[PDB]
Design a protein around this motif. Structure first.
Motif, mmCIF file in Angstrom:
data_model
loop_
_atom_site.group_PDB
_atom_site.id
_atom_site.type_symbol
_atom_site.label_atom_id
_atom_site.label_comp_id
_atom_site.label_asym_id
_atom_site.label_seq_id
_atom_site.Cartn_x
_atom_site.Cartn_y
_atom_site.Cartn_z
ATOM 1 N N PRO A 251 -84.088 66.716 -9.302
ATOM 2 C CA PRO A 251 -85.084 67.093 -8.074
ATOM 3 C C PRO A 251 -83.837 67.967 -6.434
ATOM 4 N N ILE A 252 -84.484 68.758 -6.257
ATOM 5 C CA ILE A 252 -83.964 69.063 -4.762
ATOM 6 C C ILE A 252 -84.160 67.901 -3.524
ATOM 7 N N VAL A 253 -83.150 67.312 -3.106
ATOM 8 C CA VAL A 253 -83.648 65.809 -2.110
ATOM 9 C C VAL A 253 -83.880 67.149 -0.409
ATOM 10 N N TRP A 254 -84.935 67.401 -0.335
ATOM 11 C CA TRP A 254 -85.286 67.456 1.212
ATOM 12 C C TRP A 254 -86.108 66.425 1.773
ATOM 13 N N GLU A 255 -85.909 66.268 3.092
ATOM 14 C CA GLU A 255 -87.076 65.151 4.207
ATOM 15 C C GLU A 255 -88.371 65.575 3.204
ATOM 16 N N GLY A 256 -89.157 64.737 3.161
ATOM 17 C CA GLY A 256 -90.462 64.494 2.641
ATOM 18 C C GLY A 256 -90.666 64.676 1.289
ATOM 19 N N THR A 257 -89.897 64.737 0.096
ATOM 20 C CA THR A 257 -89.878 64.505 -0.931
ATOM 21 C C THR A 257 -89.532 62.931 -1.604
ATOM 22 N N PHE A 258 -89.421 62.039 -0.481
ATOM 23 C CA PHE A 258 -88.763 60.806 -1.691
ATOM 24 C C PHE A 258 -89.403 59.724 -0.315
ATOM 25 N N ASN A 259 -90.052 58.783 -1.222
ATOM 26 C CA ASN A 259 -89.843 57.434 -0.027
ATOM 27 C C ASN A 259 -88.713 56.385 -0.457
ATOM 28 N N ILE A 260 -87.910 56.454 0.980
ATOM 29 C CA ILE A 260 -86.881 55.784 1.107
ATOM 30 C C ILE A 260 -87.298 54.220 0.453
ATOM 31 N N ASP A 261 -88.070 53.655 0.776
ATOM 32 C CA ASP A 261 -88.761 52.283 0.601
ATOM 33 C C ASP A 261 -88.346 52.021 -1.099
ATOM 34 N N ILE A 262 -88.858 52.711 -1.556
ATOM 35 C CA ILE A 262 -89.173 52.872 -3.213
ATOM 36 C C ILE A 262 -87.579 52.983 -4.064
ATOM 37 N N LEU A 263 -86.908 53.401 -3.227
ATOM 38 C CA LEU A 263 -86.153 54.050 -4.094
ATOM 39 C C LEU A 263 -84.656 52.707 -3.306
ATOM 40 N N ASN A 264 -85.160 52.449 -1.918
ATOM 41 C CA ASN A 264 -84.230 51.192 -2.312
ATOM 42 C C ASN A 264 -84.210 50.220 -2.610
ATOM 43 N N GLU A 265 -85.389 50.216 -2.869
ATOM 44 C CA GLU A 265 -85.469 48.513 -3.687
ATOM 45 C C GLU A 265 -85.366 49.078 -4.850
ATOM 46 N N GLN A 266 -85.513 50.231 -5.835
ATOM 47 C CA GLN A 266 -84.337 50.486 -7.216
ATOM 48 C C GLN A 266 -82.905 50.485 -6.871
ATOM 49 N N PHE A 267 -82.298 50.813 -5.921
ATOM 50 C CA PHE A 267 -80.880 50.848 -6.309
ATOM 51 C C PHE A 267 -80.594 49.426 -5.709
ATOM 52 N N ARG A 268 -81.214 48.709 -4.836
ATOM 53 C CA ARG A 268 -80.554 47.338 -4.360
ATOM 54 C C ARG A 268 -81.001 46.343 -5.376
ATOM 55 N N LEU A 269 -81.936 46.383 -6.341
ATOM 56 C CA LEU A 269 -82.626 45.467 -7.234
ATOM 57 C C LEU A 269 -80.719 46.014 -8.329
ATOM 58 N N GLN A 270 -79.534 47.137 -8.841
ATOM 59 C CA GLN A 270 -79.054 47.236 -9.343
ATOM 60 C C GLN A 270 -77.965 46.633 -8.888
ATOM 61 N N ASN A 271 -77.995 45.931 -7.391
ATOM 62 C CA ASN A 271 -76.309 45.963 -7.042
ATOM 63 C C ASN A 271 -75.217 47.266 -6.675
ATOM 64 N N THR A 272 -76.046 47.905 -6.532
ATOM 65 C CA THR A 272 -75.215 49.509 -6.585
ATOM 66 C C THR A 272 -74.108 49.213 -5.446
ATOM 67 N N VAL B 66 -95.184 68.143 -7.741
ATOM 68 C CA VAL B 66 -93.718 68.197 -8.450
ATOM 69 C C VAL B 66 -92.431 67.249 -8.505
ATOM 70 N N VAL B 67 -92.618 66.578 -8.055
ATOM 71 C CA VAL B 67 -92.162 65.668 -8.349
ATOM 72 C C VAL B 67 -92.612 64.040 -7.003
ATOM 73 N N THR B 68 -92.584 63.113 -7.952
ATOM 74 C CA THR B 68 -93.167 61.942 -7.062
ATOM 75 C C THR B 68 -91.749 61.220 -5.910
ATOM 76 N N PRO B 69 -92.671 60.567 -5.300
ATOM 77 C CA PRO B 69 -91.711 59.776 -4.415
ATOM 78 C C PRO B 69 -90.334 59.241 -4.762
ATOM 79 N N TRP B 70 -90.442 58.328 -5.706
ATOM 80 C CA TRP B 70 -89.038 58.329 -6.780
ATOM 81 C C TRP B 70 -88.419 58.852 -6.924
#
Lengths: 288, 288
Positions: A36-57, B29-33
């Motif tokens: 992935p090339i990370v731009w605004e509009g490509t990600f849902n930060i709520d899903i990502l924060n859950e994934q990383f917090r659950l791993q105690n990052t 081409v990329v999911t929100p996660w």
């Protein structure tokens, strides 16, 4: 931790992803090697924060502040507190020749800072090599035991908007803001075959900026070790790459593809480049 | 191997990635996660083949062929030989009630087939659970020692075009061809709260097909174990999910997001759905 057994995400309510609608119609959002090339509009930060917090990052942020560059630390750290990895554990590592000049910045819960003194080397060659050398050696001294990911940035910068766990991956580089729209022949790679950083005119994916790179501790240790060793070969051969460690970083990421690439939202200079329409957010910016 | 020390890629000449041009203007081409969604035009297979070959990757392909479904094995295996992971090590695992009915298909170098007998269970409940149960138990019997990745597919299918290392990742699911353009409320998830597979009407990213999923051996062992255990709870509670193991797979991938999602190019039925413009390739297709 990274890659350990992970519990289910909780129930979350968010808009359904739209398979037949591109998330951006104006930019490339995935590399040809499926990073992935990370731009605004490509990600849902709520899903990502859950994934990383659950791993105690835990995220380590390294910065070098030598000579007059210590003046930049106050704004750098104050703005990191507002925008960088908020809600996650953070360890700042400030490498400096002047420990007493590090400002007393108030930190949020779960966030800590360590000051690491650097040797005031007399030879410019050793100064040139210092960041790669020191980052690689502190992988064993501290980083392997203390953090899951490292983020390595320049100090003469400030955060203006969100920089969070969307960047985290085994190895990432950032599109340099001077070259994201350029042809590869215009990239300022090292072009002399006598250098270990050499890239021919028909090779190259992107021009990555030396001011913002990172990854898991293991992958950053590999990158920094490789760049340091390549710089020592060049010094023995009496050649200095055109853009120093940034030229070596670019050679390394051509041969070892990153697993995410950050857009220039993450590395920008508004004085030199303004605020183009393609940047929806300016997240980390040069101080004029 | 996966994630081991990796040598540099060789010099390669290919078109420069275009940062200001989307690789597809018609699909996501990329999911929100930040998992890639694999469509034609998103990947350069030469770069990916180099990355996976340098890691000495072995791919296991599992298929169940029970009762009259053994008739489908000849075309399935012959077309896999033409299109599936060509150039990489492959181990086919054919689970069947009729070992003597497995056809003698000629295999390319580096490719092997094992026949694994299944018990002819009398109770439909045990038959329903069998694939998840058997895939999870063969993770220890064979797969952990024999392969790096597993691909789990249905037999009543044929390959028509390239299916290669672009799909490989720790955990992947495939967009079901009946639902890739549908709203989540129309997805045929299990909707009764009494089932472990239950997903409410306001939840769900995609409808994944049970006919094509996979990942690293560790992640497939986790998925299949979880689905098997969830099916046993349902059986004790006297409920059978609407689409059996596919309903459980969908619950699992909602709660444990995949690291790549395959487009319907990878799981299609031309008799029922034709050949829409959005599919540039039809790679793995139902046999009519």
């Amino acid at each position: 931790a990274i890659g350990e057994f992970m519990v289910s995400l909780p129930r979350m309510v968010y808009p359904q992803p739209k398979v037949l609608t591109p998330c951006r119609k104006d930019v490339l959002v995935v590399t040809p090697w499926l990073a992935p090339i990370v731009w605004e509009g490509t990600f849902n930060i709520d899903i990502l924060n859950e994934q990383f917090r659950l791993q105690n990052t835990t995220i380590g942020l390294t910065v070098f502040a030598i000579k007059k560059y210590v003046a930049f630390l106050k704004l750098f750290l104050e703005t990191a507190e507002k925008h960088f990895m908020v809600g996650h554990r953070v360890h700042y590592y400030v490498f400096t020749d002047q420990p007493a000049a590090v400002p007393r910045v108030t930190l949020g819960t779960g966030r800590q800072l360590s000051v690491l003194e650097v040797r005031a080397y007399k030879r410019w060659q050793d100064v040139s090599m210092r960041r790669m050398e020191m980052i690689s050696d502190f992988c064993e001294r501290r980083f392997l035991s203390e953090v899951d990911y490292l983020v390595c940035v320049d100090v003469d910068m400030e955060f203006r908007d969100h920089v969070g766990v969307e960047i985290l991956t085994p190895l990432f580089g950032t599109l340099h803001p001077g070259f994201y729209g350029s042809s590869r022949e215009a990239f300022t790679y090292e072009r002399r075959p006598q250098s270990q950083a050499y890239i021919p005119k028909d090779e190259g994916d992107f021009y990555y900026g030396g001011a913002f790179f990172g990854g898991s501790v293991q992958e950053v240790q590999r990158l920094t070790r490789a760049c340091h060793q390549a710089m020592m070969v060049d010094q023995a051969n009496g050649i200095e790459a055109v853009w120093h460690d940034e030229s070596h970083l670019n050679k390394y990421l051509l041969r070892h593809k990153p697993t995410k690439v950050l857009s220039p939202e993450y590395l920008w200079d508004q004085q030199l480049l303004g605020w183009p329409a393609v940047l929806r957010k300016l997240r980390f910016t040069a101080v004029p």
